[PDB]
Amino acid sequence: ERVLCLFDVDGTLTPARQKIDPEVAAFLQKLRSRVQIGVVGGSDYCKIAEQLGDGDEVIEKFDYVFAENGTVQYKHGRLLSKQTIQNHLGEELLQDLINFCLSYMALLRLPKKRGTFIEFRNGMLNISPIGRSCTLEERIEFSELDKKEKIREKFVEALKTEFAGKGLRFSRGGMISFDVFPEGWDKRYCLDSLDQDSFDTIHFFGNETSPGGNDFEIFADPRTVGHSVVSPQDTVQRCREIFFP
Ligand SMILES: O=c1[nH]cnc2c1ncn2[C@@H]1O[C@H](COP(=O)(O)O)[C@@H](O)[C@H]1O
Ligand SMILES: [Mg+2]
Ligand SMILES: [Mg+2]
């Protein structure tokens, strides 16, 4: 009788990068009367909290908050100790990756460069040829050039070949950047901790559950009952069907 409903955020509970619709938020608390609820998203905690409430409301509204794919975890209001990428990969491979990226970017000539070309996060390194500290206009300008020249795509091809067999994965999306993360540090990462919390059933809901999507792995994992949704309204409807028939 112990059930967790675990939700992707962008396009599953909220419009992408935007605040949750109050009506959806209301349903989630209603659902909470029957099951525990949780979110897992690739973004950092600050971004997730921003979309799901004011201040740190998110950690009171949800029983679990998994940011950066679960490498950061809040469980019933309490922050757990974080996993760092350097402990998993080791300093030598991490620095090999960093230096390859620095060397590669040094040779790229762009309309503009700024700063934060390599952002060190808990769950990944984010690599941006223009640099993350660029304005909106600068970002769009880079993006247009990127599509014409396949700048990020070529960089990722070179990276994958160089590190073949070494257990690194690379994101396929993004606008001015791409993600580098250890194999298994997709959304499945949060499942290891959840394994210990005595749930009879964990239902996962996501809008990117086809191959290539950032929900595919957690959706397909045998530890979850998987649900594919197309919008927050679809998500609410699915939960109504299953939990309030
Ligand atoms: O494949 C993707 N799917 C979802 N998010 C991504 C993907 N690739 C990068 N991101 C994240 O999306 C955010 C915004 O991307 P940006 O437009 O390149 O800054 C960054 O924090 C990235 O880590
Ligand atoms: Mg999504
Ligand atoms: Mg599954």
Tell me the sheet residues that pair with 168: 182
Cβ(37)–Cβ(63) under 8 Å? yes
What resolution (Å)? 1.9
Helix, strand or coil, per DSSP, at residue 85 = helix
Handedness of CA 15, 16, 20, 26 (dihedral sign): positive
Residue nearest to atom 11 of ligand 1 (CA): 174
Instruction: Determine the topology of domain 84-185 in CATH.
Output: 3.30.1240
Taking the CA of residue 42 as reference, the ligand 1 atom at the shortest distance is 5
Ligand 1 pocket mutation pick from 175, 177, 185, 217 by most atoms within 8 angstroms of CB: 177
Cβ(199)–Cβ(35) under 8 Å? no
Nearest ligand to the CA atom of 178: 1
HSE on the CB side for 158, CA within 13 Å?
12
Method: X-ray
DSSP run (H or E) holding 6: strand 3-7
Instruction: Annotate 105-115 with b (16+ C-beta within 10 A) or e (fewer).
Output: beeeebeebbe
Does the active-site annotation cover 10?
Answer: yes
Q: What is the DSSP string of 165-203?
A: TS-EEE-S--SS-EEEEETT-STTHHHHHHTTS--SEEE
Tokens 């992707």, located at residue = 8
What would you report as the CA-atom Rg of the chain, rounded to the nearest whole angstrom?
Answer: 19
Tokens 């090999």, located at residue = 96
Taking the CA of residue 173 as reference, the ligand 1 atom at the shortest distance is 1
Sorted by where each begins, the domain ranges of the chain are 1-83+186-245, 84-185
Ligand 1 pocket mutation pick from 44, 120, 179, 181 by most atoms within 8 angstroms of CB: 179
**226/219 Cα distance (integer angstroms):** 5
Tokens 């490498």, located at residue = 71
Active-site hit among 10, 146, 186, 215: 10
Architecture field, domain 1-83+186-245? 3-Layer(aba) Sandwich (3.40)
Given the DSSP bridges, would you call strands 178-182 and 225-228 parallel, antiparallel or unpaired?
unpaired
Question: Is 224 assigned a ligand-binding role in the annotation?
Answer: yes
Q: Which of 58, 59, 56, 52 is nearest to 24 (CA)?
A: 52
